[PDB]
Paper text:
Of them, the most active variants, αsA1 ([name]-[name]-[name]), αsA6 (F46L-C258A-W263M-I280T), αsB5 (V27A-I76T-Y97W-Y99F-L130P-L226V), αsC6 (L72I-Y99F-I122L-L228M-F229S-W263L), and αsD6 (V27A-Y97W-L228M-W263M) were subject to kinetic and structural characterization. It should be noted that αsA1 was obtained in a previous engineering effort, and that four of the five selected variants contained a substitution of the key residue W263. Overall, all variant exhibits improved catalytic efficiencies against all tested substrates, with the exception of αsA1 with malathion (~2-fold decrease). Interestingly, variants αsA6 and αsC6 exhibit enhanced lactonase activity against γ- and δ-lactones, while αsA1, αsB5 and αsD6 show reduced lactonase catalytic efficiencies. Although the active sites of the improved variant structures superpose well onto the wt-structure, all selected mutants display altered loop 8 conformations. Changes are subtle for some of the variants (e.g. αsA1), but are large for others (e.g. αsC6). Because part of loop 8, including position 263, is located at the enzyme dimer interface, altered loop 8 conformations modulate the relative orientation of both monomers. In the case of the mutants characterized in this study, the dimer reorientation yields significant displacement up to 5.2 Å (e.g., αsA1, between equivalent carbon α positions), as compared to wt-[name].
Phosphotriesterase-like Lactonases (PLLs) are appealing candidates, being natural lactonases endowed with promiscuous phosphotriesterase activity. PTEs and PLLs belong to the amidohydrolase superfamily, and share the same (β/α)8 barrel topology. [name] exhibits high acyl-homoserine lactones and oxo-lactones hydrolysis abilities, and promiscuous, low phosphotriesterase activity. [name] is a very appealing candidate for the bioremediation of phosphotriesters because of its unique thermal stability, and its ability to resist aging, solvent and protease treatments.
Author numbering:
A (entry chain A): 1 to 261, 271 to 314
B (entry chain D): 1 to 314
The structure:
């Protein structure tokens, strides 16, 4: 009745339950895979995604939000297959993931034309299916807010205003891209509480994280396990600090795990690391179950309502 | 047998006949087309491509070389359908068309791993078929020779050295990228005669063009009809001058026609001020008649359109 799900009837936000807000079943570069299909093994990809998702569900995860969009190899049919094999609630999105320029398709195309693509996926369905997009994903990274990155951001704001679906972002935690995304969306009329600024858990700069939260958006502590960006124990210290300072109303936690899509870079990276390490860490440091529920149930409910 | 053809037995290069060295049956952004198929009408693309190819064949064209590769929507199965509807000799390629950065697949991958993809397409076949690639296509434009652009350039060198297929380039005629491409490839051991430096017809700077040709490479006068890069009359004037100064044996001419393109610019849609007479047969309607009435004999026309493509693929 409000949040579309891959391969199922849409649900009211009250039924989302325990959510992993940012996880990927599979990512790839569309052009590479179309051109050199011998590099990929779909059977293996499917088997690893299904296993990872089953494991999450054994810890009580009900819904996964998967922000694989254009540029990351969104495949709605693969997603459907995983949903049939697992029973997971899966929220698919629309959007564009670029760091510099858009594909040449977009040359002399307006922001509204871009937004029309997102709205098509939200109102009509994704890739020829009746599976509808539940959110818009956008990105910026080390190159910053380029001209084309900015067009995409503005297009996301149009789609949100027209359809009410929330916006998930990718940012670089160390160069202000997050704060800029929030600002441009917000200036374009997006409710700050319909934005999740992503990858803030990549830094232990608490003042920058709070800045974005205090402007009204969710803060993505969303790469647990990617030690190369920030080690688990430092993420844990940051999370705990934010909870202790009263920020659990804006915290969202996830792994950004690539289910099929490393001893030094990400030794215990998986879709269940927060059950194995983070949540027990927090509980040992005095965080109650009510806070856990706020982060993994209440916050996603608010984001999608 | 020595040039692979899509949907046909390979041909000796001496049999290639009258050739258009750089034309596209269809181009698109793979990511866009994968994510928003509602934007594209395959029927219309197929009908347009077939119509263009048949009209080129009526003018005597035997062979078309199509440098649509990764980044431009190469689709060997579409190409097969076009061959089967027309009987054209079609040469498909491999390569990577980027202006700035490689797709994220290539993060922390070596130049060799890039080359192996090219070698795969040339020795094994394209996209799971046995249609083999006959050349490598690479690109550089306004952003210049970026690090990833250079990785692709060096990958093409390795592929040529291993398989012997020639290299076609896309360049920006106004920023030296063509000469940079030639430089880096010749440094890596590629024979200059196996390189076509593209889009040099986009300038009337005759001295730049000549510099590349004197270094031993073919020069692509290859966007006839794309008036936004350079109008037909200035292209014709440049082409003629090069032929008079003795450069016939290095000149290749084409239209770079996109029988179907997905960009919004779209150089011919309510916007045919950018490319009014642009089609795959414009050289038969304008350029060849112009050369012929300005002292260029049938021999020189045969050199450009038959002999040079034959050498390039030998
Ligand atoms: Co991200
Ligand atoms: Co080109
Ligand atoms: Fe992600
Ligand atoms: Fe081209």
């Amino acid at each position: 009745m409000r949040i579309p799900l891959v391969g199922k009837d849409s649900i009211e936000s009250k039924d989302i339950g325990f959510t992993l807000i940012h996880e990927h079943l599979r990512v790839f570069s569309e052009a590479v895979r179309q051109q050199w299909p011998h590099l990929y093994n779909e059977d293996e990809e499917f088997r690893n995604a299904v296993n990872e998702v089953k494991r999450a569900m054994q810890f009580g995860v009900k819904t996964i939000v998967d922000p694989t969009v254009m540029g990351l190899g969104r495949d709605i049919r693969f997603m459907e297959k995983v949903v049939k094999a697992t029973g997971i609630n899966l929220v698919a999105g629309t959007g564009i993931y670029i760091y510099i320029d858009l594909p040449f398709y977009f040359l002399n195309r307006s922001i509204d034309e871009i937004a029309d693509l997102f709205i098509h996926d939200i109102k009509e369905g994704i890739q020829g299916t009746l599976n509808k997009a539940g959110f818009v994903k956008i990105a910026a990274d080390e190159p910053g807010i380029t001209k084309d990155v900015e067009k995409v951001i503005r297009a996301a704001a149009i789609a949100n205003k027209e359809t009410k679906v929330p916006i998930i972002t990718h940012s670089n935690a160390h160069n202000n891209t997050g704060l800029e995304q929030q600002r441009i969306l917000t200036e374009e009329g997006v409710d700050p509480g319909k934005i999740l600024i992503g990858h803030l858990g990549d830094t232990d700069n608490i003042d920058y994280i709070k800045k974005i939260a205090d402007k009204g958006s969710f803060i993505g502590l969303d790469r647990y396990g990617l030690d190369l960006f920030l080690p688990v124990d430092k993420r844990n210290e940051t999370t705990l600090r934010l909870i202790k300072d009263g920020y659990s109303d804006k915290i969202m936690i996830s792994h950004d795990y690539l289910c099929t899509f490393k001893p030094k870079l990400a030794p215990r990276w998986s879709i269940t690391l927060i059950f194995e390490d983070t949540i027990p860490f927090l509980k040992r440091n005095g965080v109650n179950e009510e806070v856990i529920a706020t982060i993994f149930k209440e916050n996603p409910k608010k984001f999608f309502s």
